[PDB]
Amino acid sequence: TVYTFPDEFKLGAATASYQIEGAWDENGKGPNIWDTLTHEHPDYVVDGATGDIADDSYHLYKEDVKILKELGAQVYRFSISWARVLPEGHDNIVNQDGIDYYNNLINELLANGIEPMVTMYHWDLPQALQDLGGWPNLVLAKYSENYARVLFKNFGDRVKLWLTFNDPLTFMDGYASEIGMAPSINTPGIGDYLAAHTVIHAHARIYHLYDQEFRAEQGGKVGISLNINWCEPATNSAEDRASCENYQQFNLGLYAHPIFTEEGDYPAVLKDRVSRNSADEGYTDSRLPQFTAEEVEYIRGTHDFLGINFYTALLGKSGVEGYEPSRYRDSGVILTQDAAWPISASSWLKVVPWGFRKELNWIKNEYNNPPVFITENGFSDYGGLNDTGRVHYYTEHLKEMLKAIHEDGVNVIGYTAWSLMDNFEWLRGYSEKFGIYAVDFEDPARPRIPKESAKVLAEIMNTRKIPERFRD
């Protein structure tokens, strides 16, 4: 029983637009912040790589559907490129080519019995909107609503699973470093918090828009995808446990407390620590933006499920480190990783499968057991089809998730592997491979070929259980 997926549980795979599509300036698509970063700042990216072509999924979407069908995916999570649909960011111009492209992909998926799950925003902001300041500028919340309206109107008759945003914990960090994630702006502890504030507002507007303009007719569900690492106390002390709770609230709670709790607002520890630190450093005003009571009420409850992106764990101990000002310093935890944990091809990613079960329980307890859809989980290597590390990563994480479901009563409703195929891994270029399908980036045809992990995942999806040879 503990090895069997619930009957209604949805299994599949995931991608994101900039990471796979290419066709960066084709047929009316406007420029986004990742076009800008990779073109203007190739020194920020391994190999000076760009997403100009990537997997060429703009042209090769039928091949993506073919491999999803081979895999036996029930659901395909993909993102829509804002600047492909609205090249100017604002909704004055709708690019029919972009509408046609996503309709073509959606229709191809449905014709092959695969359900689309659409992420509206997976990091590729139109440059025209970044030029207003991007996410720190609250005007983007209305722009986001208008973008979502176009998506719901055009695609919502066939798409019943939506994520407003993918992992704003990461993309807010594009406003906390001059050399990091797009748009690579150095306003740590200030602009990243403003970005988070706008995103939360935007998410809430999009959810209310769905309620007001689309839900009665379309009958779908709207969530948000949040990335969170498990944070394990470095020792069993109360003080180290406090530091790990700080971590959860500063990383997951920053977004999830306003939306998924009955109280709403930011977590108290976030408000209080930032207020204190801001005062001690001489600011008249806290660096953390505030919600009014009306805004708190508007934002809380804006969810039909919680998307979780889970990859790894950290150790946390009591203390403070990091630069002043910064979110890490404000969070009041000292983070490390255990040397004993198995490694990947990504410095940040260690294999800690039991951390997944711990995190699912933390979420259950904090947010009253919301329906949780695992929108990303996966593992990097540098190449190869006999990807034993990836196979082990998936079988262990899926076992831990199944224990969370069956033993712990966590309402997990679906799981999409990150990623369907090797793709453009942001600042790591094509150097780190997360796919279950390999892609030859030196071959203009970009063939997708199954790794051992794709074969094992297909077996899991077909049998709806963890095969005996992978059980404890």
Ligand X SMILES: O=S(=O)(O)CCCN1CCN(CCO[C@@H]2O[C@H](CO)[C@@H](O)[C@H](O)[C@H]2O)CC1
Partners of 76 in the β-ladder: 13, 116
Task: Choose from Cl ion, Na ion, ligand X, none: what does 164 bind? Cβ within 5-8 Å by kind.
Answer: none
Give yes or no for residue 469 binding Cl ion (CB under 5 A).
yes
Residue count of the chain, please give it: 472
* Contact region with Cl ion (CB under 5 A), list: 67-75, 374-382, 413-421, 460-468: 460-468
Task: Choose from ligand X, Cl ion, Na ion, none: what does 227 bind? Cβ within 5-8 Å by kind.
Answer: ligand X
Task: Figure out which of the listed residues 35, 124, 145, 376 binds ligand X, where binding follows CB under 6 A.
Answer: 376
Give yes or no for residue 242 binding Na ion (CB under 5 A).
no
CB 350 within 8 A of CB 313: yes
Give yes or no for residue 97 binding Na ion (CB under 5 A).
no
Amino acid letter, 17: S
Query: How many Å separate Cα 234 from the centre of its chain?
Result: 27
Task: Figure out which of the listed residues 290, 301, 348, 388 binds ligand X, where binding follows CB under 6 A.
Answer: 348
CB 467 within 8 A of CB 459: yes
Looking up tokens 């500028």 gives: 137
User: Which of 361, 398, 359, 371 has the alpha carbon at shortest distance from 11?
Assistant: 398
Give yes or no for residue 94 binding Na ion (CB under 5 A).
yes
Minimal distance, residue 150 CB to Na ion, in Å? 5
Range list of H helices, 231-381: 238-248, 254-260, 268-280, 293-299, 327-331, 353-367
* Contact region with ligand X (CB under 6 A), list: 103-111, 162-170, 195-203, 354-362: 162-170
Query: How many Å separate Cα 222 from the centre of its chain?
Result: 14
Give yes or no for residue 434 binding ligand X (CB under 6 A).
yes
Choosing from 115, 145, 376, 425, the catalytic residue is 376
CB 378 within 8 A of CB 393: yes
**Binding-site string for Na ion from residue 141 to residue 180, where x marks contact by CB under 5 A and - marks none:** ---------x------------------------------
Task: Choose from Cl ion, Na ion, ligand X, none: what does 167 bind? Cβ within 5-8 Å by kind.
Answer: ligand X
**Alpha-carbon span 181 to 174, nearest angstrom:** 4
Task: Figure out which of the listed residues 27, 186, 235, 347 binds ligand X, where binding follows CB under 6 A.
Answer: 347
Q: Which residues make Cβ contacts (< 8 Å) with residue 299, sequence separation at least 6? A: 200, 201, 203, 204, 258, 259, 264, 291
Task: Choose from ligand X, Cl ion, Na ion, none: what does 320 bind? Cβ within 5-8 Å by kind.
Answer: none
376 is catalytic: yes
**Alpha-carbon span 193 to 288, nearest angstrom:** 6
By rule CB under 6 A, what count of residues binds ligand X? 14
* Contact region with Cl ion (CB under 5 A), list: 24-32, 229-237, 365-373, 461-469: 461-469
Minimal distance, residue 17 CB to ligand X, in Å? 10
Give yes or no for residue 262 binding Cl ion (CB under 5 A).
no
Q: Which residues make Cβ contacts (< 8 Å) with residue 401, sequence separation at least 6? A: 356, 357, 360, 374, 412, 415
CB 417 within 8 A of CB 378: yes
Query: How many Å separate Cα 184 from the centre of its chain?
Result: 19
Query: How many Å separate Cα 219 from the centre of its chain?
Result: 24
Task: Choose from Cl ion, Na ion, ligand X, none: what does 294 bind? Cβ within 5-8 Å by kind.
Answer: none
CA distances from 458 to 12, 14, 362, 398 (A): 10, 15, 30, 13
Residue 193 or 311: the one with the smaller Cβ distance to ligand X is: 311
Give yes or no for residue 320 binding Na ion (CB under 5 A).
no
Task: Choose from Cl ion, ligand X, Na ion, none: what does 127 bind? Cβ within 5-8 Å by kind.
Answer: none
Give yes or no for residue 166 binding ligand X (CB under 6 A).
yes
Minimal distance, residue 70 CB to Cl ion, in Å? 22
Burial of 304 (0-12, 13-18, 19+ CB in 10 A): middle
Task: Choose from Cl ion, ligand X, Na ion, none: what does 94 bind? Cβ within 5-8 Å by kind.
Answer: Na ion
Residue 133 or 180: the one with the smaller Cβ distance to ligand X is: 180
Q: Which residues make Cβ contacts (< 8 Å) with residue 468, sequence separation at least 6? A: none
Task: Figure out which of the listed residues 17, 119, 227, 249 binds ligand X, where binding follows CB under 6 A.
Answer: 227
Minimal distance, residue 304 CB to Na ion, in Å? 24
Q: Which residues lie near ligand X (CB under 6 A)? A: 16, 19, 166-167, 170, 227, 309, 311, 347-348, 376, 418, 425, 434
Binding site for Cl ion (CB under 5 A): 468-469
Chain contacts with Na ion (rule: CB under 5 A): 94, 150
Catalytic residues: 376
